[PDB]
C-alpha cells in the first residue's frame, strides 16, 4: 500500500540511535544481488511520496546512520515531494524544501550540512531547486516566524551556508537565483513580512578574507569616535523585477509587519533623503495647483445665473466671459481626476477588498469627478437638478484637501488619527444609535399620529435634535396620550446620553500609547507611497533618483574585476570603544 | 481643520440657497458656526427651491463637526 | 474555582512504566519542530451528571475564578 520496506521499518523503529538490524539488512542486500535499489528505497504513497532513509536519519539527528547511508551510495538529491511535505496548510504538514540539505539546514544541524556538502562519496548540489523553485536559502526564509530563537538559528545557518557556498563555488551567486514567482530570498523576505531576516540581510558584515565581497555593509573611513559606513543599495531602490521598497509599499495589506519593515537602518534614511532632495518641491507644487483649482471652482459656482432651464446664453459683458472660463476649467479638472482614477485602478488591479480597506483617497477623488460629470450631463440636458450634483462635488472638493496634510508630520499624524477613529469606533456607535432612534421613533409615531409626529421622517429628525442640544420638551400641544409621551422622551434622552458617555469612555482605551505608536508609522508608510508614485511619474523624462554614486567598496572580487554598488553613506559616532 | 471644513460647507450652502440668511458668505458662516456651540436652527420652515438637499448637507456637516471635536478631545489626553 | 488544580488535572502527563494510562494529555506523533497532542475530554463535554463546562457556565456567580476557568488550553479551543 505505502511501499514501506524492511529498511524503512528498521530506520523508524530504533532505540538510542542504534538498531543492529540495519547493518545486517545492508549486508544481506549487498550479498544477495545489489545494494543500490535497497538503500534508495522510498515511499510511493502520495502523502509520503519520495521520503527515503536519509530523511529519517536527518530527522532523528543520527550522524553515524546518515554517514553510513551516504557511504553505501544513498541518493542525496532525492525530493520528498509528498503532500505532507508541502504548502496548502489546510492539514498537518511541514515544508522544508524537499531535499536532505534543506532538511538539515531547516532543523539547525550544522554538522550534517557540512558533511553533505563536503563528503568523500557524493557532494550535495548547493544550487539545486525543489518543485517550487526554492533553494536552501528560500527554504530558510520560508521557515522564519520572527521570534527570538527562530531568528537566531535561521540567521546563523544562512550565514554559514552562504560562506560555504562562496568557498566551494566562488563564481556562483546563490542570492540571484529566483523561484517560479521570480523572487530572490531578499524579495521573498521583504514581501512575506520576515522582518528579522530582512534586518539581518540588509546590514550584514563578514570579516573573513576571501569571502569579504559577500558583505553589504562596509566602512569607508574611520577617525577616533567618528566613522563613516556604506550601505549597498543593490535592488533596494531599483531592481527591474522587484525592489524592496516596491514590494513593501505596494503589499496587499495582509503582510504581518507592513508598517515596521520601513524602520530598518538603511530604508528610513533612504526615504528621508529622497523626500528632502526632489520630492518635496513637487508635492508642494501639486498642493498649490489644487488650491488654485478649488478657488476657481468655488468662484465659478458662487456666481451662477438664477434663470431657469439651462443652458444659459453667453452675454457680451466681462463677468460672463470670466464665468464661462471658470466653468470650462472646472470641467477640465473633473475629467483629469476621472482619468487618473481609471489609470490607478487599471495599473494596480485591486482585489475587490484592497479597494476599500486601503486607498480611500483614490475613491474620494473619483467620486468627486463622477459628481462633476453628472452635473455636466444634467446641465446640457435642460435639467435644473445639476446644481445639486455640483454642490456635492464642491463640498467634497474641500474635504479632500486633507489629503495634502501628509508632508507635514504633525498634521499627517493628526489626520491618520481622524481616519482610524472614523473607521474603528464611529461605525460601532452609529449602528446602536440608529437602532435606538428608529425604535423610539416608531413608538412615538404609533402613540401620536398627528401634529409633527405623523411620519417617521419628521419624528426621526425631531428625536435627532435632542442629540445635539436642540430639543423641545415644552409639551404645549393637547395630545390624547400625554404623560405617556413624556416617559418615552425621558427614557430616550437618558439612554442616548448613556450611549454618548460610553463612547467617550471607550475611546480612551486607545490613548494608552496604542494609537500614538501605530500612527507616525502609518504616516511614514503613506509618505513612502507618495515618494514612490512621484518617482514613477517623474514629469520630465529625468531619472536621476540614484544615490551616492559608483563607489568602490572592495574592488577585489574572486576574479580580477573591481565592483561598484551605488552605496549610501551613514556617519556615526561612538564614545565607547 | 475646522476652518477648512466650515468654509467648504458655507460655500456649498450659499451656492445651493441664494436667499434668506444664506445670501452672503459671512451670514452663512455665522449660521453654521452656531451649530458647533449648540445654538443651531433645524426648523426648515422656509420655502426654498432646493429643500431636502439642504437637510442632507446640514446633517453631514453636523456629523463631521462632532467627529472632529471628538477626535480633538481624545487626542489631547495623550499629554496626560 | 480551584484554577490551579483544574489546570493541572486537565493536561497532566505521567510518563513512567505501568502507570502511563493515568495521563490525560498524550502525544499522537512528532515530526521535528511540529508535533500533535491529544486531550482526553472525558467528563468535559458530557457525562450526564456534572460536566466541567456545565459546572463552570451555570455557576451561581459566587465562584472566584468563574471568568478565568474557561481560558485553560482544552476548553477555549473546544468552545471555539
Ligand atoms: C459631502 C460628504 C463628505 C464626506 C467626506 C468624508 C471625510 C473626508 C476625509 C478625506 C481624507 C482623504 C484621505 O486622505 O483618505 C484617508 C482615509 O480616508 C477616509 O477616512 C475615508 C472615510 C470614509 C487616508 O487613506 P489612504 O489613501 O492614505 O490609505 C491609507 C494607507 O495609505 C496607509 O498606508 C494605511 O494602510 C491606512 O490604513 C490607509 O487608510
Ligand atoms: Na443647547
Curated annotation (Swiss-Prot), chain A:
Residues the record lists as binding Ca(2+): 472
Ranges facing Cytoplasmic side: 1-281, 347-359, 406-420
Transmembrane segments: 282-302, 321-346, 360-380, 385-405, 421-448, 484-512
UniProt-reported outcome of changing residue 530 to A: No effect on PMA-induced enhancement of capsaicin-evoked currents but reduces direct activation by PMA
Region (AD) location: 510-538
Extracellular side: 303-320, 381-384, 476-483
Subcellular location: Postsynaptic cell membrane; Cell projection, Dendritic spine membrane; Cell membrane
Post-translational modification: Phosphorylation by CAMKII seems to regulate binding to vanilloids. Phosphorylated and modulated by PRKCE, PRKCM and probably PRKCZ. Dephosphorylation by calcineurin seems to lead to receptor desensitization and phosphorylation by CAMKII recovers activity.
Consequence the record notes for mutating residue 48 to A: Strongly reduces affinity for ATP
The name this protein goes by in its record: Transient receptor potential cation channel subfamily V member 1
Entire-sequence positions represented here: 152 to 751 of 838
